[model samples]
Target: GSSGSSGDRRSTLHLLQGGDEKKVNLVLGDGRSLGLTIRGGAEYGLGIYITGVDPGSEAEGSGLKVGDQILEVNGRSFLNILHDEAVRLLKSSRHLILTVKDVGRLPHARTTVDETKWIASSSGPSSG
Candidate 1:
């Protein structure tokens, strides 16, 4: 097998599934376009919300809808990230596993998203 020459994009599909849980794993084959738009940031008037979910996309099929918020992208915390920062993370990879919160089901996701905070190893680097 060969390796990536430079600027290693995460090119393989992650089978790290079957948790069936709070944070969700969303895989996009066929292409890297999730077919949705992000509306977020204090400047954008909210957290990273999925403003649009186009029809016939993996985003819709995975139960991801408009008003859903991206809590994290592929293990990187979106919790305290700026809009461009979040954008970079989502765009950085090929396969995306997103930690999403359904704002409709859990209406307490917070306009400020403070108080009920969490913990995780948010540092990321591909290798040494």
Candidate 2:
């Protein structure tokens, strides 16, 4: 048997570490796994606790920022789906479709993201 903290760490380690050929699997706040294929691309950079990925994963590196409220995934908007469900969709889908609210927009901005190859964690400018 394992302690809860140990179990959590093990789970997180297993989740983050993988073979050379890996897939994107990020858990959203709602407990949904957005299995994204990270790849290089440009993002407008706005809103969120985190954002601005330079590429090489399921996220496809786009306008998505951390604090941005995920309105939808694929075509299924978050309104009808649970947060975890949405994360699941993001993780499972080959592409990402989102409606996010940023600082500039009064409401929110909608954007679509395509899947691509993964980039090594060592690439790009520091978020700090």
Candidate 3:
């Protein structure tokens, strides 16, 4: 079926689940790094998201905000990497050049997986 003229169609800015966003670069000194609580799942799907930032921490001082998607760490891709692997990569560098995407206003009803639970569930009973 066809209805009306295609020219009549109109479009507007549609903010995704994460809302309007942009990228930013932040550098942290050695041994003094961003104090961040990170989590994965939702919005970007398996992307590592900054759940919280410690006040007065390097992350806060560097302008990192909650809900920022960590695109890369020191030019290495953090996307789709496991949580532990990402942490390892971050810690491996003395100087960090972070590429992050600001996910604008936090989305309501955010869901996150508990890493402990995830690990426990994934692993079977241990042998003595």
Candidate 4:
């Protein structure tokens, strides 16, 4: 069992801390599951996405739709992981608190993200 630790104060590093804590939480209880298929991965470098939110899925009616990038799963990041690992990770747990972003909304959305800041790319060439 786990017990409390004291005098051993927590080296709390709540970097992105603030109120209103907004994020989608999928409470997939009732033995129900989000049978949504996923696409994209480290290979694609575009990030994992909802291929299809099933006809009667928690996603379809609840909130999410197709093509939304699944950036985070629960408290863990899903930024980079191949299909094999991604599938297993989803199957591994139901503690689902998803953090997805819609790519269509962002202009010039590339798998390799751009720097919002301008000064970095000194040479200033789109040589990629």
Q: Per-residue alpha-carbon lDDT of model 2 for 1-128, expressed as tens digits? A: 25445465444333554422222233345433333322211132322122433244334444343434444445564555543444345566554455544534446554545366544576677797
Model 4 backbone overlap count:
0
- Candidate 2 achieves a global lDDT of 0.41
Instruction: Rank all candidate structures by their lDDT, best first, as comma-separated numbers.
Output: 4, 1, 3, 2
* Inter-residue clash pairs, candidate 3: none
Worst 10 residues of 1 by lDDT: 1-10
Instruction: State every prediction's TM-score relative to the real structure.
Output: 0.55, 0.34, 0.54, 0.56
How well does candidate 4 score on lDDT at residue 105? 57
- Ranking of all predicted structures according to TM-score, beginning with the best and ending with the worst: 4, 1, 3, 2
Clash count list over all predictions: 0, 18, 0, 0
lDDT of 1 at 128: 85
Tell me which residue pairs clash in candidate 4: none
- By lDDT, the best candidate is 4
For candidate 3, write residues 81-105 as lDDT tens digits.
7877776666667666667765665
- lDDT by residue for model 4 (1-128), tens: 12554335664333564643336677666567677788878887767788777788776666777767787887777888787778777766677777776456547645665577445545766779
Candidate 1 accuracy as lDDT:
0.70
Please give the TM-score that candidate 1 achieves against the real structure: 0.55
Q: Best by TM-score, which number?
A: 4
